[PDB]
Amino acid sequence: DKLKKVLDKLRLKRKDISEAAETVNKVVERLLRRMQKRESEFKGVEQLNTGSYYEHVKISAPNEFDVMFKLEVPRIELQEYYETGAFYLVKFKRINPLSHFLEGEVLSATKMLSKFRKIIKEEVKEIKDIDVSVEKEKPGSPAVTLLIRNPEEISVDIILALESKGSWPISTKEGLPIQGWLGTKVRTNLRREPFYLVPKNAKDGNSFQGETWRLSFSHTEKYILNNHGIEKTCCESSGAKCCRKECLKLMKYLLEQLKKEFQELDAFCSYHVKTAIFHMWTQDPQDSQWDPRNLSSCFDKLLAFFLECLRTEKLDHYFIPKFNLFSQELIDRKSKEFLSKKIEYERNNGFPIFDK
Amino acid sequence: DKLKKVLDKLRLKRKDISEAAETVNKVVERLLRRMQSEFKGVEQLNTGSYYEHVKISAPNEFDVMFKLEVPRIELQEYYETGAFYLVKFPLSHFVLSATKMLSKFRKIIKEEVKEIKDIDVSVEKEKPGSPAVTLLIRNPEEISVDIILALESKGSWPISTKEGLPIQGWLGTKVRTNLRREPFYLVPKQGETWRLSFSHTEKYILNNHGIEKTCCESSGAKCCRKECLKLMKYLLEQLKKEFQELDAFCSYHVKTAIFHMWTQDPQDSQWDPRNLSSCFDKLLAFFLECLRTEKLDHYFIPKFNLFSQELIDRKSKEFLSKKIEYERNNGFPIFDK
DNA sequence: ATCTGTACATGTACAGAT
DNA sequence: ATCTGTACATGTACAGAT
DNA sequence: ATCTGTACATGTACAGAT
DNA sequence: ATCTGTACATGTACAGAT
Ligand SMILES: Nc1ncnc2c1ncn2[C@@H]1O[C@H](COP(=O)(O)OP(=O)(O)OP(=O)(O)O)[C@@H](O)[C@H]1O
Ligand SMILES: Nc1ncnc2c1ncn2[C@@H]1O[C@H](COP(=O)(O)OP(=O)(O)OP(=O)(O)O)[C@@H](O)[C@H]1O
Numbered sequence: 001d002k003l004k005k006v007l008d009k010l011r012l013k014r015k016d017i018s019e020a021a022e023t024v025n026k027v028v029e030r031l032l033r034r035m036q037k038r039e040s041e042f043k044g045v046e047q048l049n050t051g052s053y054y055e056h057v058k059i060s061a062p063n064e065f066d067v068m069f070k071l072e073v074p075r076i077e078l079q080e081y082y083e084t085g086a087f088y089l090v091k092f093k094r095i096n097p098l099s100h101f102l103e104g105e106v107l108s109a110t111k112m113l114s115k116f117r118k119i120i121k122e123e124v125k126e127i128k129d130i131d132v133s134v135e136k137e138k139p140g141s142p143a144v145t146l147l148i149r150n151p152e153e154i155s156v157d158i159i160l161a162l163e164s165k166g167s168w169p170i171s172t173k174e175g176l177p178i179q180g181w182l183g184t185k186v187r188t189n190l191r192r193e194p195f196y197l198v199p200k201n202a203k204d205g206n207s208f209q210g211e212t213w214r215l216s217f218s219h220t221e222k223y224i225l226n227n228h229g230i231e232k233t234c235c236e237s238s239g240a241k242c243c244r245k246e247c248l249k250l251m252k253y254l255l256e257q258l259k260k261e262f263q264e265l266d267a268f269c270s271y272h273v274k275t276a277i278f279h280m281w282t283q284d285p286q287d288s289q290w291d292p293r294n295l296s297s298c299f300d301k302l303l304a305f306f307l308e309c310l311r312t313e314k315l316d317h318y319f320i321p322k323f324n325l326f327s328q329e330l331i332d333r334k335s336k337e338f339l340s341k342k343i344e345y346e347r348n349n350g351f352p353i354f355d356k
Numbered sequence: 357d358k359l360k361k362v363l364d365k366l367r368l369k370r371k372d373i374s375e376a377a378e379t380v381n382k383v384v385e386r387l388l389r390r391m392q393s394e395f396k397g398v399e400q401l402n403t404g405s406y407y408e409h410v411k412i413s414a415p416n417e418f419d420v421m422f423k424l425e426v427p428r429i430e431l432q433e434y435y436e437t438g439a440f441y442l443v444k445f446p447l448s449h450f451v452l453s454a455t456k457m458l459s460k461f462r463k464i465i466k467e468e469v470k471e472i473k474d475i476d477v478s479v480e481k482e483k484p485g486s487p488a489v490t491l492l493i494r495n496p497e498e499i500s501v502d503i504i505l506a507l508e509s510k511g512s513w514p515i516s517t518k519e520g521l522p523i524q525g526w527l528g529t530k531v532r533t534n535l536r537r538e539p540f541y542l543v544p545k546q547g548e549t550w551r552l553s554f555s556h557t558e559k560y561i562l563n564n565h566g567i568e569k570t571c572c573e574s575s576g577a578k579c580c581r582k583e584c585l586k587l588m589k590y591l592l593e594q595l596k597k598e599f600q601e602l603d604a605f606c607s608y609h610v611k612t613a614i615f616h617m618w619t620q621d622p623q624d625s626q627w628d629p630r631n632l633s634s635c636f637d638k639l640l641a642f643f644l645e646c647l648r649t650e651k652l653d654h655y656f657i658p659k660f661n662l663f664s665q666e667l668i669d670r671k672s673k674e675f676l677s678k679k680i681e682y683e684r685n686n687g688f689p690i691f692d693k
Numbered sequence: 694a695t696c697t698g699t700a701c702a703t704g705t706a707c708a709g710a711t
Numbered sequence: 712a713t714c715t716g717t718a719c720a721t722g723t724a725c726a727g728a729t
Numbered sequence: 730a731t732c733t734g735t736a737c738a739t740g741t742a743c744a745g746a747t
Numbered sequence: 748a749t750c751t752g753t754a755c756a757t758g759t760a761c762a763g764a765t
């Protein structure tokens with residue numbers, strides 16, 4: 001009852017969805033078209049909608065959309081970047097529209113993301129129907145973000161991705177541990193899907209950065225979010241309804257509200273809570289451990305789990321086990337302790353940040 | 357005990373599987389070579405008990421579709437039968453006559469089988485009522501192969517199936533929609549009549565049969581759904597072996613009955629291996645109810661009654677009920693031979 | 694005359710709305 | 712409960728290119 | 730267009746642990 | 748008797764090379 005009314009707050013409205021989806025699809029269509037025209041290096045690029053809005057876990061308002069422009073790159077080998085698991089150099093044996101981005105065998109991420117961005121910037125200029133601009137480039141972002149004033153503000157991340165259809169890299173062998181939850185045939189099929197590489201695009205000044213790519217599994221996460229039960233009928237019209245997505249929404253909201261207020265929490269992002277809950281879904285595979293009548297227990301055990309990840313400084317990538325999103329090298333212990341105390345406070349005081 | 361012991365008997369042996377399959381693959385590989393003639397573009401889809409892992413006793417009967425992609429055919433229902441259709445609009449020299457198409461198809465097989473000199477393999481006399489060209493093979497052991505000619509249509513499933521495949525509370529709506537996006541097939545049966553085939557859909561179900569995704573997987577629990585199919589298949593095989601009065605029954609009847617039971621009883625825990633006996637017994641009970649009411653509807657085509665008087669005589673159904681009721685109430689003597 | 698990328702046409706799970 | 716807009720998977724048509 | 734290569738599902742088999 | 752783990756065998760989906 002307490003949290004059922006928070007979810008009612010977080011529920012998107014069909015009117016806002018229509019209006020936001022109407023505009024967003026128009027801009028994305030045009031951008032996809034221009035990509036195909038002339039002698040564009042990105043001809044052949046294909047579209048994949050990913051992220052919260054397409055998983056039906058986008059909360060509060062349909063105001064941020066993530067879409068991937070994926071380019072199939074054949075004949076490709078990969079140099080893992082310093083045993084980090086998630087970052088790679090892309091190389092080419094053979095000797096190609098991507099020639100202008102080559103740097104002798106190795107493919108440049110920033111060169112390719114700059115040209116990409118240039119094309120988007122230009123194509124946005126020729127849009128007089130709607131109020132749309134390109135956000136200033138952010139470090140670490142593989143995206144070209146559109147800022148739309150549809151009266152209301154709307155972000156769109158155009159994510160540039162390489163597509164490889166070969167078997168996933170060995171750093172993911174022990175990843176995606178869904179055998180006791182979605183099972184082994186689901187895991188095999190998912191791992192027959194392509195894998196994706198997005199530009200790391202850091203500006204830390206370290207070697208290789210600028211030619212460093214990062215693995216992406218947004219497509220697999222989209223599948224998992226919309227096929228999340230041990231029973232095939234979970235949340236279907238002739239099935240029982242679980243509270244897995246509702247729990248993700250509340251956790252997302254906790255982090256969003258806190259992040260709006262305290263900039264100490266800049267290190268953190270919603271992908272953290274997304275990863276923590278994929279683990280909880282593996283830990284607690286049965287649909288009967290996400291009964292909507294136990295919403296509070298379920299939300300509380302997800303918080304308990306997240307608290308332990310913050311304290312023990314460990315939150316493994318769901319797809320790349322050896323990569324720790326809560327490593328010291330990524331977030332201070334101070335930043336983690338600060339969030340740990342803020343979560344315990346909300347936890348033991350009636351969640352007053354939900355009423356803001 | 358009894359039933360575990362019987363299941364041990366019916367279990368195929370790795371060695372016999374290895375021997376039969378390599379010989380069977382040789383003939384199908386060679387036959388499918390030849391076909392791509394008017395059947396160029398024919399693709400091989402393996403079907404039936406052996407490929408569903410419910411073949412019992414011996415690997416001695418294999419089923420194969422040679423399906424043919426055929427575009428924008430008009431379909432027309434046969435006097436409201438449900439499952440039989442006339443087909444209208446390379447294959448020009450055949451309304452598409454199933455009889456005609458089958459015969460040339462047959463002619464090719466026959467011709468090519470005559471060229472095989474490394475395997476003892478002949479073509480069985482044509483059986484009226486069979487859409488199959490059947491091969492009889494001798495390794496030192498007898499093995500028969502059904503080469504099934506199918507048309508493949510990539511459009512919506514016909515209207516008579518709209519209420520079919522009632523898997524919604526079992527395998528669910530997403531599975532049902534994806535299955536119905538697969539193509540549907542048409543198979544020869546009056547001379548130009550074809551029949552719908554869903555062997556491809558039945559193969560997926562047999563191998564994705566649980567309400568939980570992990571059913572019968574390495575990180576899941578075993579159910580006894582396939583063992584019940586095997587036991588019921590065995591009971592009918594042994595009865596037909598002995599009673600010519602049961603000539604009109606076939607294993608597909610048993611298969612159809614258990615699909616209904618799997619829909620009636622969707623939860624994996626209703627098919628617990630610790631409950632093999634009751635599960636078997638309630639399958640027997642359901643099958644007798646089908647006999648008693650003369651009603652066993654095609655799982656994909658609900659109006660089509662496989663147990664109508666028109667196809668199986670009232671006498672034959674009561675004869676099979678008497679014999680099953682007997683074996684049921686006597687501890688299955690027939691399982692002992 | 695044919696071929697074929699692009700995009701209309703069809704159907705339905707999901708979840709908001711009445 | 713039923714009605715219903717969006718997203719998305721797959722089947723097909725046809726303008727414009729061959 | 731056709732075929733090999735790869736991965737892992739579905740089986741059977743058999744011994745050592747329960 | 749049943750269960751676990753390893754070995755052994757076939758089927759099948761699809762990347763990619765020719
Ligand atoms: N740090 C990251 N590492 C790996 N994948 C990430 C990371 N950040 C985002 N992604 C992927 O990109 C998608 C879009 O990210 P985004 O930050 O918009 O979050 P979201 O999941 O869409 O939710 P919301 O935008 O409502 O916070 C994520 O769903 C995830 O699949
Ligand atoms: N009357 C029928 N109607 C529809 N499909 C049928 C019919 N008879 C057989 N089939 C299809 O052809 C397949 C092969 O049939 P067949 O007679 O070989 O039985 P089976 O299921 O393979 O089992 P087994 O040979 O072990 O008894 C079946 O599995 C089914 O898909």
Ligand SMILES: [Mn+2]
Nearest residue numbers: 051052064066
């Ligand atoms: Mn998002």
Ligand SMILES: [Mn+2]
Nearest residue numbers: 064065066157
């Ligand atoms: Mn984003």
Ligand SMILES: [Mn+2]
Nearest residue numbers: 404405417419
């Ligand atoms: Mn068979």
Ligand SMILES: [Mn+2]
Nearest residue numbers: 417418419502
């Ligand atoms: Mn057969």
Ligand SMILES: [Zn+2]
Nearest residue numbers: 229234235242
């Ligand atoms: Zn659910």
Ligand SMILES: [Zn+2]
Nearest residue numbers: 571572578579
């Ligand atoms: Zn099972």
